[PDB]
Amino acid sequence: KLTKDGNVLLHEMQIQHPTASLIAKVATAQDDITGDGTTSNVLIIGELLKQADLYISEGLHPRIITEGFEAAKEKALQFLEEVKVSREMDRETLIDVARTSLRTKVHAELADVLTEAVVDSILAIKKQDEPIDLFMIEIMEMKHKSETDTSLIRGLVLDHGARHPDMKKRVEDAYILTCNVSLEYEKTEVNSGFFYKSAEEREKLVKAERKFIEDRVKKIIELKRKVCGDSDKGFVVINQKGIDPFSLDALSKEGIVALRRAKRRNMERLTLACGGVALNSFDDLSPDCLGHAGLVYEYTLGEEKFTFIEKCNNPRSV
Amino acid sequence: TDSSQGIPQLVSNISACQVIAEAVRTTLGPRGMDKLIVDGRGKATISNDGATILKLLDVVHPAAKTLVDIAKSQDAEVGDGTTSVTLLAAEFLKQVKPYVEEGLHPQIIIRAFRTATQLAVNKIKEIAVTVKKADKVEQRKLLEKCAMTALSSKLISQQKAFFAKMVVDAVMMLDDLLQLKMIGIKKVQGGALEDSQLVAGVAFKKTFSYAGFEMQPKKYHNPKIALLNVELELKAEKDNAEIRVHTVEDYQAIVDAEWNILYDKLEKIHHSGAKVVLSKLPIGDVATQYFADRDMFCAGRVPEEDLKRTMMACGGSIQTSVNALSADVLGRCQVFEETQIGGERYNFFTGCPKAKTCTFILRGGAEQFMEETERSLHDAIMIVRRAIKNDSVVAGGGAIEMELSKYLRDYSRTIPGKQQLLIGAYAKALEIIPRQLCDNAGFDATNILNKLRARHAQGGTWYGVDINNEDIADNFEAFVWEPAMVRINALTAASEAACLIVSVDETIKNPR
Amino acid sequence: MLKEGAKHFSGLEEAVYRNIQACKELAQTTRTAYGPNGMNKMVINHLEKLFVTNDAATILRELEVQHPAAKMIVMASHMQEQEVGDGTNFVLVFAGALLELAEELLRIGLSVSEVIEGYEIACRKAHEILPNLVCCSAKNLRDIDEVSSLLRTSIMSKQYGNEVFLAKLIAQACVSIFPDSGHFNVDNIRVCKILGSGISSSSVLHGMVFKKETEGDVTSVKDAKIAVYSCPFDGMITETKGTVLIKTAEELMNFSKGEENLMDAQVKAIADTGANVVVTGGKVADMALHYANKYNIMLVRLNSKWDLRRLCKTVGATALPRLTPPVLEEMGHCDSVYLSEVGDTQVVVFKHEKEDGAISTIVLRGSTDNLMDDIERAVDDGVNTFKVLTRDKRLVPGGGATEIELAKQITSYGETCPGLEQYAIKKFAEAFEAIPRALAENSGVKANEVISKLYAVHQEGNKNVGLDIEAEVPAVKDMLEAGILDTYLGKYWAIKLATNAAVTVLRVDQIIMAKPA
Ligand SMILES: Nc1ncnc2c1ncn2[C@@H]1O[C@H](COP(=O)(O)OP(=O)(O)O)[C@@H](O)[C@H]1O
Fold this sequence. Notes:
The structure is cut from a larger assembly and holds chains A, B and C.
Chain A: H1 7-11, H2 18-29, H3 42-58, H4 62-83, H5 92-105, H6 113-125, E1 156-158, E2 174-178, H7 199-227, E3 234-238, H8 245-254, E4 256-259, H9 264-273, E5 291-293, E6 295-299, E7 306-310
Parallel strand pairs in A: 2-3, 3-4
Antiparallel strand pairs in A: 1-7, 2-5, 6-7
Chain B: H1 7-23, E1 35-38, E2 44-47, H2 50-55, H3 62-77, H4 83-96, H5 109-127, E3 129-130, H6 140-151, H7 158-169, E4 197-199, E5 202-204, E6 225-226, H8 249-270, E7 276-277, H9 286-293, H10 304-314, E8 335-341, E9 344-350, E10 359-361, H11 375-389, E11 392-395, H12 401-411, H13 419-428, H14 433-440, H15 446-455, E12 481-483, H16 486-503, E13 507-508
Parallel strand pairs in B: 6-7
Antiparallel strand pairs in B: 1-2, 3-11, 4-10, 5-9, 8-9, 11-12
Helix pairs in contact in B: 1-4, 3-16, 4-16, 5-13, 5-16, 6-7, 6-11, 12-13
Chain C: H1 18-28, E1 41-43, E2 51-53, H2 56-62, H3 68-83, H4 89-108, H5 112-129, H6 145-155, H7 164-175, E3 189-195, E4 210-211, H8 249-272, H9 286-294, H10 305-314, E5 336-342, E6 345-351, E7 360-366, H11 372-386, H12 401-414, H13 422-430, H14 435-441, H15 448-456, H16 488-507
The complex binds adenosine-5'-diphosphate (ADP).
GO molecular function (chain C): ATP binding; ATP hydrolysis activity; ATP-dependent protein folding chaperone; cadherin binding; protein folding chaperone; unfolded protein binding
Main location (chain C): cytoplasm
Family (chain C): Belongs to the TCP-1 chaperonin family.
């Protein structure tokens, strides 16, 4: 593990001295206030302690030293308050600040392609008057062969896709509906979490589950046919359970895509950015909970295809 | 905790190879010393062959392991030349040891060794003379000379050489291999009126006799050996099992219930045609009477080698079932005789449809003559097989290494390079056969090597070394030769082993 | 003392010492090779077979190091191995030379930033001046000798005795599929081992090749669907022993009849569902072979995990080691399965090529199992070298004739720009003299006279030291007409990876502490 930061090093070390460990803990406990201020602090403290020890060995009292230190701190605070100056915030100042931060953190090589993306994301997120929040920006990671490779997506990212690709990908105005019903969890026979001895009961339960699945897929097919009826108005369904290919083919024959194996954070971000109600039924209800999607793209790389949705309402997710 | 790479590694490898080279050295000539080997069980064995000693010994050294593996591969692919290759490799390593510490890169000696080996192979090929049906008029004179050369190896009786020639000339029908490991030989015990007898068929040694054993016919017109793994002994069958003890009729009832199935099984296995039962377990007391009452044959206590020989000669099939048999997996003989000589009952099976094995009985009426005088006949038949199968031949002994060494020494004086000393050392290391032979024979090699070098300085004939008369005579007239194909392979294997040893510069160990 | 616990010897003085000595000791056990020489090293690990190798890949894959400076180079080595075909010892030698030449600069009294900047400038200059020594080029890849010469040149680095027959066989196997233009795969060529004669009786054959006997009948139809299985002939009925001698024959006969009826129903259900042949991976039985012969069903005998793994990764089926007869769910694309007699052995041949994605399997045979490994290594190295993904390979005269020219160019360029950046440029130029020295020291003569002769003739860039005795002292030969060239992109990638590794090593160099529990 390579590191160069101050707090990251001070938090993961094996110090044999208890006083040094306590000093490091006290220094790290005051790092959640500002940005990065844990570094360039132990040197001044050590110099002040050495000066105090020298003055004590010469012959003095710690009370006078503390009073002088407090007076000097007050004078320095007054000088810093009187020497401050204002400056109009624009684009060059933030660019220079990000460049200096990248130079102090990373080497002077790839510090030019990240500052522009950071400034663009800040300008796209900040647009109001209230202070911004660092909770709507998700930083994902992948695995490639190159090194310098960055991207700024203005939409959401879906890791999983579909098991039967090659059908369509140019879906403009799409409707997304989030649910959590049991569409196709497993073909194995089940009951109520307890094994039995008779097979007639479990086979009847399996037949009833299959009939319910058929009724649900017929209901969603008729819903898609009612709310659409053409090829331009597409529909996308997100479900955490599996999807049978025999039903997926019949679904794609009319023009509606259904995804399987979805994470909780993905649907959370989808219902927070768009605004949809998560219900446990596939009935014919009001289309107010259906979220709108502008552009959908499928990126094929590695062993799993990713989905990029953009051009949605209120772009507050970079 | 110390390790190096280069010169110290090669020195350690040479020192490790010298141990296994000096471990086996005296066992080279025909009259080598014996060695007793005893493991951790408690049984000791006396052996004098180099292959048996090398097979019963393991070394925890990589170079020694590779050397013994190459030796085993050479012995398995050929069959002669196991200790000579090791001695040649040891001499090559001893000669190359002083030419390493002086700051010499061993990558320049491999080419010189390869060129020397190629020159030696070319000289052997251009000097070899082969003879096979081109003179000595009709073929009636070739067998006489072959028998004379076979008997000249060991001074034995005149009647023993003729019988050996007859037993080695009557087994050359369908044998197309280059070794006698197909038919094999078997030494018997006992005595007879004559000194040696020959027969074509299967041989059966002593058999236990009982009361009324003469009821079976001595001569059979068309016997059929019953190949059944089951036996008819008192322990196999039974006359009384788990029954209620009340009166005397239950015993007869159960014995009749068992005898019904027994008779059904015996009539089913006899209706197929088999009548010569060869049971592995010894027979009892009532089984012989029951077999004689039905005019059948019975036997017992037979080794596995005799059964294998009977299956190979008569052409039997492996039967893995007791009942429900057919009439196609049975053997067919012709003549089955029982001849008692002295204090044993010998059995002969003559008239096999597949002439494969033959019995060579050697009984003189002693207890020590049977074990002794057994390597001479083996060496004689091996020489006969090598002279019959192989075509190329050359004079054996120490008459082919001195000429090659002299030729290499004369050729090394016409090269202006660093290979002169290499070829000189290679030619000097070739002299290890006659010195070791004279040391094992208990003579003085210093008084014979000088005479050999003086005779080979301008003659260039086939003057080798002697053992009985202790002098220097022509090996071409002593009726001793060797094939011109085993020496080339042995030299090639020795050169390859030397190159593989000199190519290894260091080793790498892995803890976990 | 304050951070470490008497485990590592790191501090403010080990940088210009241990971080270089570790790499020096790691590279010292590698300069013995690099070149057509006989320096075999035995490898003893867990197989307990005592086998000698020559390439450094298997040597480094078995050695276990416990140092970060030594582990920082195996990553670059694996990256270079995954990228192009050959290229491994060059990066290590370059890194060792760079570290040994930077040790003096660090001991004199210079900062590491200036050395890093000079090394980067020298690497950029070398990368800019590299596309300038292009002599020969690839014409047409549809010929035979044009690629055979390159294959022979690539094989001569490994085996020195035999290299023409193997190169011709590899060329014939590669030209029978698809060339470099368009699309060419690598995992479509298999190598089989046959224990029989020597290497002077090899041949080529298109399609699948497997050493599997057949105790049934020759099925040359197209409806014979394959059906792979784990261990179908294991033991569906477990029989125990009641007494000591033997039990009643009635129960044994009933059990045998039941097992026979069960296996007959099983084979009938597996043959009537649309599968004429069956792939077994267990033992055999008398009634089993009897039913296989009377039902016209091909039965195999030899079983291996690699065979079933290849059949699963190629076709796409799944073994069903079940007791009850299942359904047919292993439908593949094969249909033409023929039998051939090679070396008195029965082999199978699959025909399913539609002029796209063809496969091939060369027939190999040797004495023992310890000799075919080097042949397979040479074959796969030549196959990887043949792949370049470009029509014009732009071959350069390798072997050391270009390194001296690059060093001279860097030296001439460094004597122009003033400042404190000339020392690093001179060091990077002098570090290029490590390839001819290692090639001259691994032969039999010295290396100073060879370098003087190479620098005294002319700056043509087509002169290199030979291998025979008549080319060691003079070392004046023209490798352009002989046929000794190297890969252009391979050397570039090797230099780039070596520079990256040197930069990473010179950067991270201070105090090596530990992590808390
Ligand atoms: N027959 C030859 N003639 C001249 N140079 C050779 C010959 N064989 C190999 N070389 C040189 O030896 C070097 C090492 O080759 P190789 O072992 O294939 O690559 P690596 O050392 O990366 O494994 C190559 O740069 C090549 O120029």
